[PDB]
Design an enzyme around this catalytic site. Structure first.
Site, PDB file in Angstrom:
ATOM      1  CG  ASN A 140      -0.476  -0.340   2.466  1.00  0.00           C
ATOM      2  OD1 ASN A 140       0.283  -1.296   2.633  1.00  0.00           O
ATOM      3  ND2 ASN A 140      -0.850   0.460   3.456  1.00  0.00           N
ATOM      4  CB  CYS A 147      -2.017   0.296   8.476  1.00  0.00           C
ATOM      5  SG  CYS A 147      -1.641   2.034   8.745  1.00  0.00           S
ATOM      6  CD  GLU A 204       3.795   0.885  12.844  1.00  0.00           C
ATOM      7  OE1 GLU A 204       2.536   0.851  12.827  1.00  0.00           O
ATOM      8  OE2 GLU A 204       4.472   1.667  13.579  1.00  0.00           O
TER       9      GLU A 204
END
Ligand SMILES: NC(=O)c1ccc[n+]([C@@H]2O[C@H](COP(=O)([O-])OP(=O)(O)OC[C@H]3O[C@@H](n4cnc5c(N)ncnc54)[C@H](OP(=O)(O)O)[C@@H]3O)[C@@H](O)[C@H]2O)c1
Ligand code: NA
Ligand code: NA
Ligand code: NA
Ligand code: NA
Lengths: 499, 499, 499, 499
Positions: D166, D295, D261
């Site tokens: 992404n 996210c 993450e």
């Protein structure tokens, strides 16, 4: 008696408290009477040191004190403070009794102060949070390549602690604590108005093991203390007092480190969405605690149109339902002011407000040479700025109430006083609160509570005429310590290979 | 000409530099001549502001400047500084030319100063390392339960930057930079001896976009600047000058935040295990750079018995082999002193040392009303302490050399001067070095290198008579900012369940 | 008996220690024998929990423990720890007795460990130095204008503390202390080799008031503890053990916060200018303390040509003059190793060194299934790297000695081992010391002293195969806490006026 | 073409991007097709390295890279990054074009990402705020008397940066930036789904002067990258990806430093006093930006009874009025999802919600193998917890809406998901806001704004299944650096005299 057994001299009829000259209690200067605001009667005397004794004391503190304090490792300094805390705690009633009598402080408040002093001493370990130093690598600039810096703090040497009359015990203990914890020797100069609690504190510290040549307690009156401030062996001055004396202190001392807590009052702002019960309760207490003789006493209340009525009403109800009298009755809320002189000023200040359109909402009546009812004066925004109660700090239990259209007007009126210690804001909206926080020119803002310094768990200090620098656990280190930078040079020595 | 195109007035015969009054260049007060130490000739004039103009300028800085500076976001302030750096850098030769002529600084040193100013502006982002605030949870004390604190910094408002003659460009840029980066407005008051570089710096900042009502440049002579210092709209004073004027500044200003870099000299200590070539080289440079007109100029050399001979020998060889003359010859190492008056003092100080048993090892000869040879005077430890060169700071290229038995004697003699800026120690043994670091009473210690502040990559400042507080990237924030504490009260509001 | 009165079951013939299941002492799983290295005899038994009990305990710690720990204010958590310290201190001899018997630790060392545990608990206030949060203003980027950040720490929840056999008491207390002080609940899993001291510590904490559902003590053997590590309610794992088990722990646990103190040995470097008496003394102690069963035991000595002889000589004299025997005789210096198995490895490792050119300089003789003489093996640099004593960590009192030409070779050989916990360097030259500091790949470097973690006054931890992260007063917070960022948005809300 | 002139091979018909092997671009492993989600067509190929090349690259990075990176002074590393920023900025349209085509990112978003990468590189100086070290004096414990500690950071060596699909450009630049600024070498492993932007970034860094043997770019597919993670020369792994792959990464890597993450979604809470226009606007954007492939994409909306209607209404109006199509039309708001597979999951997840009582309020219609309308599904609190959209993260533009009675229910439902990255809260009441802040189990809380990481001006990271540790300017240093403690011993050496 008590811990002052072989110290106090029952010479003639009243107890005579001598000064502590960095090694031996004593003094051969004028004796001075210490009266109580409770009955204007002489409760003791203090022996001020002669010029030669001031000179000898400073000399000892500088040539020996600095080293005794500094060469006593921190772990031991902490033990000394903890022991001192224990001593004061077991002698609590006596410390409290002396505060009540000498300062005129209600019993509950007097006990609170002693407990503050004890907690402060016992929590000196927290002051270590700001103890580390800094390691600065040098490769972020070509000029500093293969270089390195270490920044650490160092005690300055001899710190002069000048104390006010409103917290004769706590202030001496606080200033001694933060000065000593970092390795400085200290010269305490308490208010000659009520120097006894300081004497008791010093003795407790000495009994606890405080380096005997690293502390002094000089009962010098007003301008006599200038000899200490102006002396080159005094590297720092921690002062809590009035704006005017603070100014004189810096002008006499010249270049040195300073922490000046100069008080002045505090404004409290009430927004339309505030819990009015909480606000009224907290503001009333802020207005009258210890008869308004607090650097952070609320002196001005600003409330938005839609709540101004209720708010002002409640605070007045609360203020008028206050029992005034002798500080001893655990029933009494407000004891006396430190001097008839202070009450005079309060009265002259209330007439002034009335003459300029002000209306008394509570109190107003004087009750004796040193007794008064806590007063709440209503005033129109278009005339309050020229009233003495606004322009000046009337050290007494009196505050102005002013209705305002919105936050900007509140902030504007709040910033209009020459002082900037703390401010209080009651409300719930984050945006309005944030704006108030940004625009109020004060050292601190209390959201939904009255301003209260306590033991300094949070740093506090002034802006504008309220002074400079901060006191507080950890932050106080900045006023009694100095940086020491060490720059190491390894240029071309093969530690780094071009980096 | 140059960036001062429409500013400088070629009135009559010499260029006339006006003051910048926070909005418009101008002034209607006495004009004053600016002479060059190179030929005592008048190279320009400056227009000092009238009292009414000083008053109006302070008023603008306070009512508007504080807000223009503060309301310009930091990201933009940085752009302004970076642009200013670019402008000065492209006008380098011209900035350097003016330093050489107006200050009498050798060409290489003049270019170094301009490059320092540029780097300082360009590296303002590093000052952000000390920008964060503190979040203090309140559950570590029962008294603060369900409470919380936030401590952040805030600009003070208007900062007065008073500048000395030895770094007319860098000091103005440095003080303006650290004051402005945090949101303050600034009043620069350069030495009337060489105010031109400051004028050039200010114009460059204005061209770069510096809020026009947030800066002022007043060409006030000596005691005329007292009006600025004593004014209540000036919240801080950043001063670099002599001990005596600094004292006067605090006495006039009263309570305010201060940073006083008061110089005085620096002692250098050489241990038996030092690299003598490095030491001799670094110490010689420390003694003569810019003709010793540096706050941190080496004024005393102390070397242990076994190396005192070689060391002193080398430094003297190096000093005497120095070419003195006009600052322009990239060949010349030492230019003139700022005034015939300064050279007089140096000479009278050398005779004094000789009269008290001192022996000149290098230099000693005067060369003109403002020219002298850098001097190195040998002296016995048992007589040096009463010599003027020791007891006082003779702002000139002159230093004492003293043989000592060991480190303790070196340290003792080093601490014997009334100053405490920096000290240098050459050697390799960690224990001896650590002891010297602990016991030298100075703001900074340079290990194996001459003391050099540069752009302030490492903080530096005085102890004893050398002043108070620090300058340096990051640390300077403490002198031009104030803490703002915010205390939130959630007592009984259900955020915490007893904790 | 003692503080374990109603806990220990004198079932049959030996005392039976049950697990603490977050609320009630108990367990219904296999019982396990606890033997003493002093006489391989069974001194007690521990009841391991059944799978259902492990499951129920984790469930309690997670659903209730996290909240009991967190909702107990920090001021109270500190009281709990201080009380626990008092209890352990008055039961000192008993804690020490159990360490000596269960771990085989000499008496003086056993008492030292108990005193460490007590000091650690009592000094939990120092861990607050790293307690504050950060206030990040947003005007340093256009993208963040009118924005603001607050960064504070938060407990993670349930921390698994897995403990090794060499500090059965201190490690449990340390890990419990730093985990609990920040608000976490804790699951202690002591080495099944000597779990008794942990049981005594937990009980003392419970008696002191530690939230009963916020702590657990599971006597699970080796791989049985994997159920705890791999569970999602365990947010962090603080492990001190061998490199191999540590690897397994992370591979089973997956994503979580970890602190892995994996030991391995430590090399000590002696420069030509070192105080050889100090060096020999400190290095010998580093080699044999607790029979080398210390994560930071010295395993390799590197000394420059000109001192290698004397140094090695002295260390050997000191090592051979060591009294080995029963840990109880305050005369005995070295007690037994934890198992016959460990001694086997030490012996096989010494032959290996000899077979590869090594020569025993001291010790070498085995004395019983769990007893050995502390050994010092000389070895040529050109063959040491292939010796087991070098390539691996032989947990026992044995070290290699290697002569080297200079610092670079010392550093090279030191970095050649797969471990990187600490290193020691004896010498006085700052340059050489600085180079060694920069190039040694270890978590810590001890200058002029043997590596000693003590209570963690200074942070320590591994590099390379010695693990990741740090333990230490203050630093440990990073492993058992997580950041929580709060971003406030005032864009266009009128707090700032374009800034 | 462009900056990839002599790099890309126009072999056959499509451009062939080789891997960068720490010195030379190349590779001799399988070639792999890179398709565009815009038209499922092959737009290029990447050459993955052979096992021997992976081995050789790691070997170079470790034996040389660590030193080239580390031995390049920080001032120069910054120049490299600033130059790289310049290069990317002038090649903006091309970087953006490739993001739009390779990632399917709308044009405005693609340009935003490039500008983020540029700003991040250009602002690396801000990462220095957390660069200093610590000086720990030792006199606060008897055990440490005459001792001293210095704690500083050191690069770990080789950092593996594993990147998601992404933010193919920004993530590579961010991870390379914070790893390199502190002196580490880096191995970038981009998503094989869109590795081209990383290739362009690396080349720009190399052109800027990045140490050629200190960086590598390996186009390894999924499990092939495990060889890198599990290798002992890789000291740290900075991973941004799914929870499941993150788990696998730690299980393969074992003991090392990690920053994970792991995303998951974010819940947004709307209180009765929120600005509903702001809330609806911000929440809608949070729901659809980059087709929810963030996210921190909002996946659940919780609004109190009295505003649930309006709020949900507005967000739906805003969502349905969205133009879906080809990312190029500056008109299009939502482009395609990364794969037909992702859209399948979104659809199956929406039916599931409907089957369990859910009602679509906007969108719902699929538009092609990789195209879908952003969807908003209403759901009753008593049934939402069992819906896939709640229990799992459906990486797509879809969110649940749930009406709630009060804050506690909102918080409860918000904490009910297995993730804990960020959360958003819209409202104005400080108490309610503070409670939400304390109780939401997330790495970050956005007050009155949608969660947006930007360049990491504020640190952010996960709690629960959202991962461990933080990224952000300054904070990232904790994941790619290790502490190095230096303990100096002056016991009995006369530095201190008992202190
Ligand atoms: C340093 O630090 C080391 C510590 O001493 P040590 O010899 O006792 O080393 P160790 O065996 O590695 O100690 C491991 C600790 O972890 C536990 N453990 C063992 N296997 C485990 C597993 N598979 N999953 C979770 N936990 C497990 C052990 O319990 P048990 O005692 O029940 O095996 C023990 O408490 C020294 O050897 C030196 O290298
Ligand atoms: Na003075
Ligand atoms: Na003044
Ligand atoms: Na896991
Ligand atoms: Na591994």
């Amino acid at each position: 008696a008590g811990l002052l057994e072989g110290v106090i001299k029952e010479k003639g009829g009243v107890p005579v408290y001598p000064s502590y000259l960095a090694g031996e209690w004593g003094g051969s200067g004028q004796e001075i009477e210490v009266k109580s605001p409770i009955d204007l009667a002489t409760i003791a005397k203090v022996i001020s040191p002669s010029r030669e004794e001031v000179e000898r004391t400073l000399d000892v503190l500088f040539k020996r004190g600095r080293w005794s304090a500094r060469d006593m490792p921190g772990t031991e300094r902490l033990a000394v403070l903890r022991k001192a805390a224990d001593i004061i705690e077991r002698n609590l009633d006596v410390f409290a009794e002396v505060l009540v009598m000498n300062a005129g402080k209600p019993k509950s408040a007097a006990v609170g102060e002693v407990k503050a002093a004890v907690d402060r001493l016992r929590l000196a370990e927290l002051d270590l949070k700001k103890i580390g130093g800094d390691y600065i690598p040098g490769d972020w600039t070509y000029d500093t390549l293969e270089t390195e810096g270490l920044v650490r703090r160092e005690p300055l040497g001899v710190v002069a602690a000048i104390t006010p009359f409103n917290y004769p015990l706590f202030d001496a203990v606080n200033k001694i604590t933060y000065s000593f914890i970092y390795g400085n020797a200290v010269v305490v100069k308490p208010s000659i108005s009520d120097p006894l609690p300081a004497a008791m504190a010093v003795k407790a510290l000495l009994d606890a093991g405080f380096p005997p040549d690293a502390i002094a307690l000089l009962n010098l009156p007003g301008k006599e203390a200038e000899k200490i401030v102006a002396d080159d062996r005094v590297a720092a001055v921690s002062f809590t007092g009035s704006t005017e004396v603070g100014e004189r202190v810096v002008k006499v001392g010249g270049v040195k480190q300073y922490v000046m807590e100069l008080g002045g009052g505090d404004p409290a702002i009430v927004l339309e969405d505030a819990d009015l019960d909480l606000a009224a309760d907290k503001i009333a207490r802020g207005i009258y605690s210890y008869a308004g003789q607090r650097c952070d006493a609320i002196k001005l209340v600003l409330a938005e149109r839609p709540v101004y009525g209720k708010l002002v009403e409640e605070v007045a109800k609360r203020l008028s339902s206050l029992r005034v009298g002798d500080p001893r009755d655990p029933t009494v809320d407000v004891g006396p002011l430190i001097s008839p002189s202070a009450v005079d000023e309060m009265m002259a200040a209330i007439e002034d407000a009335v003459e300029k359109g002000g209306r008394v909402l509570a109190g107003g009546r004087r009750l004796g040479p040193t007794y008064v009812q806590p007063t709440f004066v209503e005033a129109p925004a278009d005339r309050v700025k020229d009233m003495v109660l606004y322009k000046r700090e009337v050290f007494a239990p009196v505050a102005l109430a002013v209705e305002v259209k919105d936050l900007d007007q509140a902030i504007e009126l709040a910033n209009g006083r020459p002082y900037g210690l703390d401010a209080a804001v009651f409300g719930r909206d984050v945006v309005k609160i944030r704006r108030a926080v940004r625009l109020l020119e004060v050292g601190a803002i209390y959201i939904n509570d009255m301003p209260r310094h306590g033991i300094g768990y949070y740093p506090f200090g002034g802006r504008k005429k309220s002074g400079v620098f901060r006191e507080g656990i950890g932050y106080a280190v900045e006023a009694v310590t100095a940086y020491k930078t060490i720059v190491f040079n390894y240029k071309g020595k093969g530690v780094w290979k071009y980096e």
